[PDB]
DNA sequence: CGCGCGGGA
DNA sequence: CCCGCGC
């Protein structure tokens, strides 16, 4: 977020052009440009981006999400004068309080109303109790009294809550998540009346949003229940309609949930007073709100002065009436526990699968349990983010390791003297040069060997935010504190300022976008500034300066070591990237052999990534839910091979585990933090769906492919990429590029990079080849959605039962196809999918997890094992 | 192989 | 919409 400016995020279904006009008028009076954007997946995008201290200055969303944001410290406290607060209705301010603090400005107010056909029903009923008799009349006329969405409890809750239901008890400025109001007599009475309506055929238990909307807008039912978003559609129809107070139940008003569109201020915003002034003096005025409202209607409004104007529309007046008789929707993330439990209870009670009493008894206890576990997982997440490696660092160990490293440097120097230079395998390594193309030979059936630098330029210098560590003492400090043990005397360590790293990340994605999401001139310009580390073994540590926001979340209350280097004091270090050079031998034989076995046996699924950026082959423990009949680990070819093999059903599973474990073993010898990361993030329920004793569940494979610069947001904390070559020839380009670290390299005999793929922008330049040479690239990574879904399937059916279910589902689908054709087989699979989906959601509702994940971002931590350094 | 159908959200 | 799947 740039100082002296305002950027606003607001959903696409809003009046952003009108809002942009208010910005226009604001820029005119102040000189401060206001840019209005409507990103996709806005509800998810804001907490993900603001968690890194970036994103908009102002966010527009339903107030209920803003309590979760406040828990995460994403929002600035709002400080309106009492004179300003008087201009908005008092209950709208209650909607934007968290822990006694105002956290947003209310804008608009929405709630469900009763919508009725004036021609079928000139005087709509005041009571729910009237509706049975009224439906008898209209049934005689070939019509019905009432149709509304019965599938979503947002819609049925106003009746259920009328006589006493509630979500969480509110008291002393806080919701008590132990106190759920789902199982009291009021709730029971309301749901009973609802199910009696279905029991007496006045409503259909299958009625959903689309069925009700179509029936009301076609003149077939006299009433529906909907919000202001539905008025447009009714306005295109022939129906003469009104909007009024919801019916009472037992003389009490129906209690719809109230949603308040609100404007929050990013805690990481340099422009908080500019934001406050724009919101208080430009938007929250009649002129302001009208400009927005003319673009797309706001519905009811929080500003008393404009609401008095709008309320001349009786539909708006009714909205505010229903809203004032309703309950503000609780603004805490545990509402998800509430929603799932009540949705289940209403569906079961409407289908007779449970009595009303059993349905609500179980929703009550289930919602409370899920909300409690939700809290417990949030606190556990803080422990994993702040976890520390087993301590091997000390001042004595530092110094001894510094001696051994200094000895190894002399020995490597002497060995370089005796050989005439530095070599990685057979490849001559000279850091004075950048390796732009190079030759490989294939003298035998082993892997092709990198032999000769072909095209080069002088090697660009390191960027200024990246520093090679010269001191063996500092080398030993970081090695012992971070669980990195690179080849003695034959590696280079680097320190990278965390703030510049983040700026450079953003510049790299800016360049990729400007190029049209490809390697074009802007990405090339950055590549020309990257320093080649081809043939080197290196590690990059980032240093986060103690806040006296950010992408990185070190705990500066954790234990502190004394650095030999004074400049680390007041900072935390983490490992962002490491490049290894694996000596060809037994391990490389095993790995290459498994790739060959899996290719020959057709076990890779071929997919396209990033539109048509490149082609990628995948294997591993996927769960492809797009495949309706998938109910076990692996791609569809893997499911099939277990049944169709006439030798050994698990053969490809053995191959995959050896492949992941062998790559993992090679990496773990150098990076002892890797098994610590595995042990920390993989749950007991996730472990059977990893590949062996690793943090890998998915493995990719690419053949002479470039890849645009990007981040892998849905993967683990660290990712492993390797390359190996087949056949001889010359490759130009194809470098792996880490532009925010300012480095690139050509993979040689068997280069491996281990890096934080969710937070370091990276990519592979396109390549050109001469001869038959093939560069095979492969990522081993954690794709957490698959392990979560599989862990959930495991909890629902039993881990070992998945193969049996998978075999049965394959057989039942083949049978249908062979008997009744392709369309029948697709119908069997769709049925399987909905059965699978229901089971997964139930386990997901029970907080069953394969991996630990950030509750705020829905992703894995940006880094782990931060080490604080302090030198008094 | 292409392009259909498909799930989840 | 997308590091699937099957006609
Ligand atoms: Fe990647």
JSON list of N, CA and C in Angstrom, two decimals, chain A residues 398-438:
[
{"chain": "A", "resi": 398, "resn": "UNK", "atom": "N", "xyz": [29.38, -23.72, 18.12]},
{"chain": "A", "resi": 398, "resn": "UNK", "atom": "CA", "xyz": [29.69, -22.72, 17.10]},
{"chain": "A", "resi": 398, "resn": "UNK", "atom": "C", "xyz": [31.19, -22.69, 16.78]},
{"chain": "A", "resi": 399, "resn": "UNK", "atom": "N", "xyz": [32.01, -22.55, 17.81]},
{"chain": "A", "resi": 399, "resn": "UNK", "atom": "CA", "xyz": [33.44, -22.36, 17.57]},
{"chain": "A", "resi": 399, "resn": "UNK", "atom": "C", "xyz": [34.09, -23.62, 17.02]},
{"chain": "A", "resi": 400, "resn": "UNK", "atom": "N", "xyz": [33.74, -24.77, 17.57]},
{"chain": "A", "resi": 400, "resn": "UNK", "atom": "CA", "xyz": [34.28, -26.03, 17.06]},
{"chain": "A", "resi": 400, "resn": "UNK", "atom": "C", "xyz": [33.88, -26.25, 15.60]},
{"chain": "A", "resi": 401, "resn": "UNK", "atom": "N", "xyz": [32.62, -25.97, 15.25]},
{"chain": "A", "resi": 401, "resn": "UNK", "atom": "CA", "xyz": [32.19, -26.17, 13.87]},
{"chain": "A", "resi": 401, "resn": "UNK", "atom": "C", "xyz": [32.91, -25.17, 12.95]},
{"chain": "A", "resi": 402, "resn": "UNK", "atom": "N", "xyz": [33.12, -23.95, 13.42]},
{"chain": "A", "resi": 402, "resn": "UNK", "atom": "CA", "xyz": [33.88, -22.96, 12.66]},
{"chain": "A", "resi": 402, "resn": "UNK", "atom": "C", "xyz": [35.29, -23.48, 12.33]},
{"chain": "A", "resi": 403, "resn": "UNK", "atom": "N", "xyz": [35.91, -24.20, 13.25]},
{"chain": "A", "resi": 403, "resn": "UNK", "atom": "CA", "xyz": [37.24, -24.76, 13.02]},
{"chain": "A", "resi": 403, "resn": "UNK", "atom": "C", "xyz": [37.17, -25.83, 11.92]},
{"chain": "A", "resi": 404, "resn": "UNK", "atom": "N", "xyz": [36.24, -26.77, 12.05]},
{"chain": "A", "resi": 404, "resn": "UNK", "atom": "CA", "xyz": [36.08, -27.83, 11.05]},
{"chain": "A", "resi": 404, "resn": "UNK", "atom": "C", "xyz": [35.77, -27.25, 9.67]},
{"chain": "A", "resi": 405, "resn": "UNK", "atom": "N", "xyz": [34.95, -26.21, 9.64]},
{"chain": "A", "resi": 405, "resn": "UNK", "atom": "CA", "xyz": [34.61, -25.58, 8.36]},
{"chain": "A", "resi": 405, "resn": "UNK", "atom": "C", "xyz": [35.84, -24.88, 7.78]},
{"chain": "A", "resi": 406, "resn": "UNK", "atom": "N", "xyz": [36.62, -24.23, 8.63]},
{"chain": "A", "resi": 406, "resn": "UNK", "atom": "CA", "xyz": [37.84, -23.57, 8.16]},
{"chain": "A", "resi": 406, "resn": "UNK", "atom": "C", "xyz": [38.86, -24.59, 7.62]},
{"chain": "A", "resi": 407, "resn": "UNK", "atom": "N", "xyz": [38.95, -25.76, 8.25]},
{"chain": "A", "resi": 407, "resn": "UNK", "atom": "CA", "xyz": [39.83, -26.81, 7.76]},
{"chain": "A", "resi": 407, "resn": "UNK", "atom": "C", "xyz": [39.35, -27.33, 6.40]},
{"chain": "A", "resi": 408, "resn": "UNK", "atom": "N", "xyz": [38.04, -27.53, 6.27]},
{"chain": "A", "resi": 408, "resn": "UNK", "atom": "CA", "xyz": [37.50, -28.05, 5.01]},
{"chain": "A", "resi": 408, "resn": "UNK", "atom": "C", "xyz": [37.70, -27.06, 3.86]},
{"chain": "A", "resi": 409, "resn": "UNK", "atom": "N", "xyz": [37.62, -25.76, 4.16]},
{"chain": "A", "resi": 409, "resn": "UNK", "atom": "CA", "xyz": [37.89, -24.74, 3.14]},
{"chain": "A", "resi": 409, "resn": "UNK", "atom": "C", "xyz": [39.33, -24.81, 2.62]},
{"chain": "A", "resi": 410, "resn": "UNK", "atom": "N", "xyz": [40.29, -24.99, 3.52]},
{"chain": "A", "resi": 410, "resn": "UNK", "atom": "CA", "xyz": [41.68, -25.14, 3.09]},
{"chain": "A", "resi": 410, "resn": "UNK", "atom": "C", "xyz": [41.85, -26.40, 2.23]},
{"chain": "A", "resi": 411, "resn": "UNK", "atom": "N", "xyz": [41.29, -27.51, 2.69]},
{"chain": "A", "resi": 411, "resn": "UNK", "atom": "CA", "xyz": [41.36, -28.77, 1.93]},
{"chain": "A", "resi": 411, "resn": "UNK", "atom": "C", "xyz": [40.69, -28.65, 0.55]},
{"chain": "A", "resi": 412, "resn": "UNK", "atom": "N", "xyz": [39.56, -27.95, 0.47]},
{"chain": "A", "resi": 412, "resn": "UNK", "atom": "CA", "xyz": [38.91, -27.75, -0.82]},
{"chain": "A", "resi": 412, "resn": "UNK", "atom": "C", "xyz": [39.73, -26.82, -1.70]},
{"chain": "A", "resi": 413, "resn": "UNK", "atom": "N", "xyz": [40.35, -25.82, -1.10]},
{"chain": "A", "resi": 413, "resn": "UNK", "atom": "CA", "xyz": [41.23, -24.94, -1.85]},
{"chain": "A", "resi": 413, "resn": "UNK", "atom": "C", "xyz": [42.42, -25.71, -2.44]},
{"chain": "A", "resi": 414, "resn": "UNK", "atom": "N", "xyz": [43.07, -26.53, -1.62]},
{"chain": "A", "resi": 414, "resn": "UNK", "atom": "CA", "xyz": [44.20, -27.32, -2.10]},
{"chain": "A", "resi": 414, "resn": "UNK", "atom": "C", "xyz": [43.76, -28.27, -3.21]},
{"chain": "A", "resi": 415, "resn": "UNK", "atom": "N", "xyz": [42.58, -28.87, -3.04]},
{"chain": "A", "resi": 415, "resn": "UNK", "atom": "CA", "xyz": [42.06, -29.78, -4.04]},
{"chain": "A", "resi": 415, "resn": "UNK", "atom": "C", "xyz": [41.73, -29.04, -5.35]},
{"chain": "A", "resi": 416, "resn": "UNK", "atom": "N", "xyz": [41.27, -27.80, -5.25]},
{"chain": "A", "resi": 416, "resn": "UNK", "atom": "CA", "xyz": [41.05, -26.96, -6.43]},
{"chain": "A", "resi": 416, "resn": "UNK", "atom": "C", "xyz": [42.37, -26.61, -7.13]},
{"chain": "A", "resi": 417, "resn": "UNK", "atom": "N", "xyz": [43.41, -26.34, -6.34]},
{"chain": "A", "resi": 417, "resn": "UNK", "atom": "CA", "xyz": [44.75, -26.11, -6.90]},
{"chain": "A", "resi": 417, "resn": "UNK", "atom": "C", "xyz": [45.23, -27.33, -7.68]},
{"chain": "A", "resi": 418, "resn": "UNK", "atom": "N", "xyz": [45.17, -28.50, -7.05]},
{"chain": "A", "resi": 418, "resn": "UNK", "atom": "CA", "xyz": [45.64, -29.73, -7.67]},
{"chain": "A", "resi": 418, "resn": "UNK", "atom": "C", "xyz": [44.88, -30.10, -8.95]},
{"chain": "A", "resi": 419, "resn": "UNK", "atom": "N", "xyz": [43.64, -29.62, -9.11]},
{"chain": "A", "resi": 419, "resn": "UNK", "atom": "CA", "xyz": [42.83, -30.01, -10.26]},
{"chain": "A", "resi": 419, "resn": "UNK", "atom": "C", "xyz": [42.79, -28.96, -11.36]},
{"chain": "A", "resi": 420, "resn": "UNK", "atom": "N", "xyz": [43.35, -27.78, -11.11]},
{"chain": "A", "resi": 420, "resn": "UNK", "atom": "CA", "xyz": [43.26, -26.70, -12.08]},
{"chain": "A", "resi": 420, "resn": "UNK", "atom": "C", "xyz": [41.97, -25.91, -12.06]},
{"chain": "A", "resi": 421, "resn": "UNK", "atom": "N", "xyz": [41.10, -26.15, -11.08]},
{"chain": "A", "resi": 421, "resn": "UNK", "atom": "CA", "xyz": [39.85, -25.41, -11.01]},
{"chain": "A", "resi": 421, "resn": "UNK", "atom": "C", "xyz": [38.81, -26.14, -10.20]},
{"chain": "A", "resi": 422, "resn": "UNK", "atom": "N", "xyz": [37.62, -25.53, -10.16]},
{"chain": "A", "resi": 422, "resn": "UNK", "atom": "CA", "xyz": [36.46, -26.06, -9.44]},
{"chain": "A", "resi": 422, "resn": "UNK", "atom": "C", "xyz": [35.57, -26.84, -10.39]},
{"chain": "A", "resi": 423, "resn": "UNK", "atom": "N", "xyz": [35.05, -27.97, -9.92]},
{"chain": "A", "resi": 423, "resn": "UNK", "atom": "CA", "xyz": [34.22, -28.84, -10.74]},
{"chain": "A", "resi": 423, "resn": "UNK", "atom": "C", "xyz": [33.00, -29.28, -9.95]},
{"chain": "A", "resi": 424, "resn": "UNK", "atom": "N", "xyz": [31.86, -29.33, -10.64]},
{"chain": "A", "resi": 424, "resn": "UNK", "atom": "CA", "xyz": [30.67, -30.00, -10.13]},
{"chain": "A", "resi": 424, "resn": "UNK", "atom": "C", "xyz": [30.47, -31.22, -11.01]},
{"chain": "A", "resi": 425, "resn": "UNK", "atom": "N", "xyz": [30.76, -32.40, -10.45]},
{"chain": "A", "resi": 425, "resn": "UNK", "atom": "CA", "xyz": [30.91, -33.60, -11.27]},
{"chain": "A", "resi": 425, "resn": "UNK", "atom": "C", "xyz": [32.01, -33.35, -12.28]},
{"chain": "A", "resi": 426, "resn": "UNK", "atom": "N", "xyz": [31.67, -33.41, -13.56]},
{"chain": "A", "resi": 426, "resn": "UNK", "atom": "CA", "xyz": [32.61, -33.09, -14.64]},
{"chain": "A", "resi": 426, "resn": "UNK", "atom": "C", "xyz": [32.49, -31.65, -15.14]},
{"chain": "A", "resi": 427, "resn": "UNK", "atom": "N", "xyz": [31.54, -30.87, -14.63]},
{"chain": "A", "resi": 427, "resn": "UNK", "atom": "CA", "xyz": [31.30, -29.53, -15.17]},
{"chain": "A", "resi": 427, "resn": "UNK", "atom": "C", "xyz": [32.25, -28.51, -14.54]},
{"chain": "A", "resi": 428, "resn": "UNK", "atom": "N", "xyz": [33.00, -27.75, -15.35]},
{"chain": "A", "resi": 428, "resn": "UNK", "atom": "CA", "xyz": [33.85, -26.70, -14.80]},
{"chain": "A", "resi": 428, "resn": "UNK", "atom": "C", "xyz": [33.00, -25.56, -14.24]},
{"chain": "A", "resi": 429, "resn": "UNK", "atom": "N", "xyz": [33.24, -25.24, -12.97]},
{"chain": "A", "resi": 429, "resn": "UNK", "atom": "CA", "xyz": [32.51, -24.20, -12.26]},
{"chain": "A", "resi": 429, "resn": "UNK", "atom": "C", "xyz": [33.42, -22.98, -12.12]},
{"chain": "A", "resi": 430, "resn": "UNK", "atom": "N", "xyz": [33.00, -21.85, -12.69]},
{"chain": "A", "resi": 430, "resn": "UNK", "atom": "CA", "xyz": [33.70, -20.58, -12.51]},
{"chain": "A", "resi": 430, "resn": "UNK", "atom": "C", "xyz": [32.67, -19.46, -12.29]},
{"chain": "A", "resi": 431, "resn": "UNK", "atom": "N", "xyz": [32.53, -18.99, -11.03]},
{"chain": "A", "resi": 431, "resn": "UNK", "atom": "CA", "xyz": [31.54, -17.93, -10.75]},
{"chain": "A", "resi": 431, "resn": "UNK", "atom": "C", "xyz": [31.81, -16.58, -11.41]},
{"chain": "A", "resi": 432, "resn": "UNK", "atom": "N", "xyz": [32.95, -16.40, -12.08]},
{"chain": "A", "resi": 432, "resn": "UNK", "atom": "CA", "xyz": [33.11, -15.21, -12.91]},
{"chain": "A", "resi": 432, "resn": "UNK", "atom": "C", "xyz": [32.12, -15.19, -14.07]},
{"chain": "A", "resi": 433, "resn": "UNK", "atom": "N", "xyz": [31.54, -16.34, -14.42]},
{"chain": "A", "resi": 433, "resn": "UNK", "atom": "CA", "xyz": [30.68, -16.44, -15.59]},
{"chain": "A", "resi": 433, "resn": "UNK", "atom": "C", "xyz": [29.27, -16.88, -15.26]},
{"chain": "A", "resi": 434, "resn": "UNK", "atom": "N", "xyz": [28.32, -16.43, -16.07]},
{"chain": "A", "resi": 434, "resn": "UNK", "atom": "CA", "xyz": [26.95, -16.89, -16.00]},
{"chain": "A", "resi": 434, "resn": "UNK", "atom": "C", "xyz": [26.71, -17.89, -17.14]},
{"chain": "A", "resi": 435, "resn": "UNK", "atom": "N", "xyz": [26.20, -19.07, -16.81]},
{"chain": "A", "resi": 435, "resn": "UNK", "atom": "CA", "xyz": [26.08, -20.17, -17.77]},
{"chain": "A", "resi": 435, "resn": "UNK", "atom": "C", "xyz": [24.75, -20.07, -18.51]},
{"chain": "A", "resi": 436, "resn": "UNK", "atom": "N", "xyz": [24.80, -19.53, -19.73]},
{"chain": "A", "resi": 436, "resn": "UNK", "atom": "CA", "xyz": [23.58, -19.30, -20.52]},
{"chain": "A", "resi": 436, "resn": "UNK", "atom": "C", "xyz": [23.16, -20.51, -21.34]},
{"chain": "A", "resi": 437, "resn": "UNK", "atom": "N", "xyz": [24.12, -21.30, -21.78]},
{"chain": "A", "resi": 437, "resn": "UNK", "atom": "CA", "xyz": [23.85, -22.60, -22.39]},
{"chain": "A", "resi": 437, "resn": "UNK", "atom": "C", "xyz": [24.99, -23.53, -22.05]},
{"chain": "A", "resi": 438, "resn": "UNK", "atom": "N", "xyz": [24.75, -24.82, -22.15]},
{"chain": "A", "resi": 438, "resn": "UNK", "atom": "CA", "xyz": [25.74, -25.81, -21.75]},
{"chain": "A", "resi": 438, "resn": "UNK", "atom": "C", "xyz": [25.45, -27.15, -22.41]}
]
